[PDB]
Every structure is written in C-alpha cells, then in structure tokens.
From a paper:
Three subsets of Bcl-2 proteins interact to determine whether cells commit to apoptosis. The BH3-only proteins then associate with anti-apoptotic Bcl-2 relatives (Mcl-1, Bcl-2, Bcl-xL, Bcl-w, Bfl-1/A1, Bcl-b) preventing their binding and inactivation of Bak and Bax (effector Bcl-2 proteins) which can then form oligomeric pores at the outer mitochondrial membrane causing cytochrome c release and caspase activation. Although the pro-survival Bcl-2 family members share several functions and structural features, the distinctive regulation of Mcl-1 makes this anti-apoptotic protein unique. Mcl-1 has attracted attention because of its established role in preventing cell death by binding and sequestering pro-apoptotic BH3 proteins, thereby mediating cancer cell survival, as well as intrinsic and acquired resistance against cytotoxic and some targeted therapies, including venetoclax.
Numbering used by the authors: 172 to 321
Write the structure that this text describes.
Amino acid sequence: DDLYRQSLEIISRYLREQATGSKDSKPLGEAGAAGRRALETLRRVGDGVQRNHETAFQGMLRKLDIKNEDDVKSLSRVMIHVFSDGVTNWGRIVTLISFGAFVAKHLKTINQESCIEPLAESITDVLVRTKRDWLVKQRGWDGFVEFFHV
Ligand SMILES: Cc1cc(CSCc2nn(C)c(C)c2-c2cccc3c(CCCOc4cccc5ccccc45)c(C(=O)O)[nH]c23)nn1C
C-alpha cells in the first residue's frame, strides 16, 4: 500500500516533469525519504534510456498511435503482456517508466496533458501489482537508488 503510493508519486512526478520540460518538481508527501534520491536517479538513468533508445521508442510510439484517453486506456493490455514476458530487473523497470515519460511528452504535444496522470496510474498498477514480491526483496526504491548508485 505504502509502496504503491510511493511508486505512483515517483512515476507521476517524473512523467509530469518530462512532459513540461522540467528538471524538478515539489514533493507530494507519499514518496518519503527514498523519494528524492529515487527521482534524482530516475532522471539520470531514465533520460539516458530515452536518449539511447530514441529510434525504438519513436517506432513503438508511432505503432501504438496514441491520440486520446481511450487510446491511453488500451495500452495496459500490451503493457502488462510485454513487461511480464521474461526476466525481472531494474533495467526493465527503468525502460517501462522511461517509455512512460516518452509517451507523456507525446501527450503534451497533442494537447492531451489530461492523459498523463491516468498513464502514470496505468504504469504504477502494472509495476507494483506484478512485481510487488520482487520489489520487497530489493527494498523497493532504496534498492533502485543503490543499484544505479549515480
Ligand atoms: C509495446 C511494446 C514494446 C515491445 C518491445 S520491442 C520495442 C522495443 N525495442 N527496444 C529495444 C525497446 C527498449 C523497446 C520497448 C519500447 C517500449 C516499451 C518497452 C518495454 C517496457 C514494457 C512495455 O511498456 C509499455 C507498453 C505499451 C505502452 C506503454 C506506455 C507507457 C509505458 C510503458 C508501455 C520494454 C521491456 O520491458 O524490455 N521494452 C520496450 N513490444 N511491444 C509490443
């Protein structure tokens, strides 16, 4: 429960600042101690993932053809299917969130800023609900910060 809210805040803040072209955001009270360092790490690693995988991200975004809220809702099916296929690791978790930021930037360009918070919830549901046991074993977001040790 606490992990869900903490994850939702980190993911929501990162998607929102990526879409508005911001490098920071105010804490919303649910991310706690680990929140600041997690978002700082996610900005570093996440920005890098979007840069290094830009052609693949542009290709997939185009194929997904996201124009509105109904299209955003439809993403959860493929999101859970792809994210559940294969190994669990921090690298894949960053790819999931980074693609979310890449989609959020797209949503802002097409005046669909209202879809960003629903998308963050979609991503948080997939991440936390399918990886809760693994996240607990890694000490969640403290594990994330330590793994990348930026
Ligand atoms: C959507 C999809 C993805 C694939 C993998 S091939 C594309 C591809 N090539 N490379 C080299 C990379 C890095 C990707 C790629 C592109 C986009 C996302 C991912 C993911 C995360 C899981 C799927 O996440 C989402 C699916 C849909 C909408 C989403 C909207 C917001 C946030 C996440 C979303 C991975 C991975 O787990 O390794 N890899 C990704 N197949 N499909 C159908």
